[PDB]
């Protein structure tokens with residue numbers, strides 16, 4: 001369970017937009033097609049699981065085949081219109097983003113969103129199904145690895161391991177639990193920080209913004225605020 | 241400077257061995273993509289070897305060694321390459337770059353990584369404020385070496401795994417770039433011993449040690465094997481002692 005805050009609601013919507021922009025690439029692509037659809041399937045299974053308490057395996061598959069077979073000459077506006085029709089026919093309208101304005105915030109929101117999910121999924125885990133969670137975590141690493149502005153892509157390629165590293169810390173903690181050592185949640189960075197991925201993605205996010213001034217060799221603007229853990233836990237109303 | 245210790249000694253030789261086994265790969269490069277990726281990697285490796293061995297990068301003597309390697313017979317074996325290597329390094333007055341031992345293992349790779357970490361910490365800590373641009377270029381070179389690690393030995397699992405979490409290391413080098421950039425524009429670095437413009441002294445040594453334990457903690461989840469009760473894990477307390485790291 002994750003509090004339903006205004007920021008979280010934007011996160012939920014950005015996720016849908018991200019997913020839309022992802023499946024739109026299927027036409028443009030092999031190995032990549034397999035990787036893309038595999039990622040789009042997970043993203044959409046989880047969206048349906050959240051909206052319908054069911055992954056809707058058949059409807060989601062129908063969505064992916066369509067996107068994979070959509071006209072590669074079709075532009076984004078047309079792909080959207082057809083996407084709105086297809087999801088409608090499939091009774092997957094709740095998987096449609098409310099907004100289609102795609103920006104860096106869409107990607108950031110998506111990355112923070114996944115972090116919140118990882119935290120919650122891990123915390124509300126069921127010792128009976130630790131294997132399930134770990135499989136979910138493996139998929140999460142893949143989602144983060146493939147998030148890759150040519151400049152941004154190069155930088156991300158170089159430091160995305162910071163995030164993936166922490167997901168592995170989680171895998172380790174979980175593997176210890178399945179073998180006798182329950183986890184001990186603490187709220188500071190077999191112990192694990194609660195809201196770990198939320199803190200790591202916030203930190204990663206600030207770092208990326210700190211570094212860009214170095215890439216651009218141009219000093220920060222006047223009103224250049226920085227996100228603090230204390231203020232972030234508030235916007236998402238995180239539990240300590 | 242980096243304190244002389246039995247562990248740092250092994251590090252220096254391993255680094256030269258790793259550097260040697262890497263250039264040995266040029267003569268065998270099948271494509272241009274790899275050739276220049278190997279030559280760049282090999283160039284930076286030797287640059288830093290010459291820095292710790294001659295206090296100078298030896299930019300031009302090294303470009304000759306690389307030139308040679310790249311154009312060495314892809315027919316002879318490692319034993320023969322070693323022979324031609326020793327003579328060329330001699331001819332270019334770079335004998336200090338010849339390895340004492342040729343036993344190549346994962347330890348050789350870890351030692352090389354921990355060596356660079358120690359190098360990063362020293363060059364930053366003993367930096368000259370008027371040539372920060374120089375130190376930052378060195379760090380950029382360091383990120384390239386950590387991004388492009390060649391295992392040379394066989395272990396797909398390792399390659400894929402390092403490909404996934406190497407950013408944890410590079411991320412920290414960028415934190416150092418940020419610290420230096422700040423010093424460049426007015427705020428001097430303030431060193432502390434724990435993990436404004438504060439920066440942990442011996443940061444990369446701490447970062448590399450931690451990354452190393454992590455990798456070793458994770459291989460059990462990878463091989464679904466049970467860790468032996470004797471599993472020894474490196475502590476920062478112990479590591480500092482082994483390298484005579486200064487606080």
Ligand SMILES: Cc1cc2nc3c(=O)[nH]c(=O)nc-3n(C[C@H](O)[C@H](O)[C@H](O)COP(=O)(O)OP(=O)(O)OC[C@H]3O[C@@H](n4cnc5c(N)ncnc54)[C@H](O)[C@@H]3O)c2cc1C
Nearest residue numbers: 104105107108151152155156201202205206208209212227
């Ligand atoms: C994966 C990725 C890599 C990037 N790499 C680069 C790069 O190499 N070079 C470059 O110039 N730009 C890069 N960017 C873009 C850059 O990070 C900013 O998104 C963009 O410059 C807009 O800046 P902003 O300050 O207006 O917005 P942002 O600060 O990005 O706004 C993001 C949103 O989240 C909030 N937020 C701000 N900081 C945090 C935080 N630390 N934690 C959580 N939420 C936060 C804001 O309130 C806002 O709603 C990257 C973007 C992504 C998604």
Ligand SMILES: Cc1cc2nc3c(=O)[nH]c(=O)nc-3n(C[C@H](O)[C@H](O)[C@H](O)COP(=O)(O)OP(=O)(O)OC[C@H]3O[C@@H](n4cnc5c(N)ncnc54)[C@H](O)[C@@H]3O)c2cc1C
Nearest residue numbers: 346347349350397398401402449450452453455456459474
């Ligand atoms: C970058 C990299 C990635 C790897 N990825 C994998 C992988 O995915 N899966 C896998 O099974 N193996 C992987 N390995 C190999 C693995 O880490 C070990 O090298 C190997 O399993 C042998 O372990 P060992 O028990 O001999 O100890 P090693 O860890 O190899 O010991 C080497 C030396 O380092 C010292 N040392 C030990 N821990 C530390 C530390 N934390 N800090 C500093 N020195 C330390 C030891 O005292 C010893 O002298 C990787 C190796 C490298 C270099």
